[PDB]
Amino acid sequence: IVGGESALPGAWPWQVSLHVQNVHVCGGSIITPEWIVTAAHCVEKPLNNPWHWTAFAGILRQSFMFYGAGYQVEKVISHPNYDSKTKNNDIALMKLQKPLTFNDLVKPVCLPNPGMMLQPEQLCWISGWGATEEKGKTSEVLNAAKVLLIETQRCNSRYVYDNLITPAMICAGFLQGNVDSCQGDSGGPLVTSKNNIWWLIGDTSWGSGCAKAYRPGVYGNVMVFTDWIYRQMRADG
Template sequence: MALNSGSPAPYYENHGYQPANFYPPQPPGAPSAPPAYATPYYLSPVPEYVPRVLTQDSTPVIRPQPKPPSPTVCSSKAKKALSITFTVVAVLSGVVLAAVLLWKFCECRGSWTLSAGGSWSHSLWCGAVWCCVVCPSRTHEDSPSPTVRLYGPDFILQVFSAHRKSWHPVCWDDWSESYGRAACRDMGYKQSFYSSQGVVDNSTATSFMKLNTSAGNIDLYKRLFHSDSCSLKRVVSLRCIECGVTTKVTRESRIVGGKNASLGDWPWQVSLNVQGAHVCGGSIITPEWIVTAAHCVEEPLSNPRYWTAFAGILKRSLMFYEYGYQVAKVISHPNYDSKTKNNDVALMKLQTPLTFNDRIRPVCLPNPGMMLEPTQTCWISGWGATQEKGKTSDELNAAQVPLIEPWRCNKSYIYNNLITPAMICAGYLQGYVDSCQGDSGGPLVTLKNSVWWLIGDTSWGSGCAQANRPGVYGNVTVFTDWIYQQMRANS
């Protein structure tokens, strides 16, 4: 977190890499750091790339010399055996060819639809009635996986209708906790469920998904059918995890301008370390998952074994005494561009789940349908340098920054059209308050409906706290679907 020192500085991208004194001094009496790997990797002030040289196999290929044909005696018995062999081969070839033609003619087609009765039905037909006996059987696994999401600041549960190509809220009628748990699992919350309740729908929906209580199958999606209204005039609000909650109530007067944080202020903030040194920040979204920036995990740091996460700690010097969480997986956004920093987001999955308490809590992922003000008040936090080209801070700092509209941030005298829809600008055009080196990957959060939402991850900027050079953050609001997909696929 930087305050402008007033002196000009060269262009700088928030890589989070440390320019000097990469290993912080170990406090007296602190236990020794864990042993390094067999081939330790020492970070450079800038990303380094290992060239890959393609080589050809130099092993000579030994080709056996062909043997001269040996004379054979063709007896009448041998001729008869050869004739029988050719006949069998010809018959088998004919059978295979007939089977292929039959399968081609009898190509089975089918589709899954959501019936008015509330169950998934499968329509199957073939090219001819008599060939249906050879059609492969279809099971529920072949049905499309119903897509669910949470909408708006009230966490309204919505289900996507493939038939109508649109999203629909779910009626509170006959809803139960077991259905809520099933929906949470489908969104990637492996064993997490917080609450579900009926709320008034403010999305002006005209069509809903309703539970068919007479359906025999207990599967949630086999019970859903379209309805024009909800009997109870309420829809399902689903919370899969208790997120966006802090132990602090008043904070504005203390953090504006980059002040030291207190325990419980930003419980989702983590320090991501490589070989005992802070490299980047991150945000807790579940006990196992952390959101950070893709540029933090560029090669060769894409290997999860390099990384250790520390949570619930304010001072980096105290991390020597605390338990660190090893990283099991590193997943960078497939469309991340290392040159433009477009789609600068990544996920880390921990080997051991975090235990939540007053100091360690998750932040909420932004739901689609959330309306933010053009200059929405946000907060940034991290252990980044407190001045241009300075050292990272030992204490966690936080500062208040407003969002800056994309059209303004793309003006020629600011970032000249470098800001894409996958980026967010935040800060002050006059400078003075900004994220800086070492803050990369850390959170940009906002408070709405008494809940803290992760709006961005610290990505890049030109210098630190310079005039007309605000901080640029990955736009987490456009990454939410991708994050849920990765949580589902890697649960």
């Protein structure tokens, strides 16, 4: 997050950070208290053995324990049609072995129903634990920023990406710069204000630097993969 401010302890209970080898690598979001929605590029072959994974919830500053007080991941389900060259279909699901009962500052986000009729220049918000300005370290405190949704046709311009965005993937950010996520902001909850309820419609997959001109943010689209999550949840139970 570049150009943002520190996130006050309000009500944002849809950000779960995954920790492996006692260090933070990638985050994620939760929709139901039985799964974890996160990116799929961190679930590669060297990142196997999901037993060595923990999840933290309701934790702003990442210092409250040491190799303990977490939720162990039982199984991880990734999208079968995942490509490592073009980075397409970068959505993975992690299942927890704990009931995860609802408590204070614990409230998931509902999936977006088909046919939302979203505005072209819709206002959204981002959050995560990444660098500060450029090639920095993991942020100790939680920060948030405000981004806008740009069109796919304008994102496919020859001077921006030259037609490198799939129809099942969208772009969000500012073309002027100074508002972008750096390396380490994997996943991240991208929600918007509509009908007094937030909708998770974004998922960070990759990116070309941060706070750079003609290089907006990259956030996946879950409107096409919404049925896949329901299918996996039905096949699991």
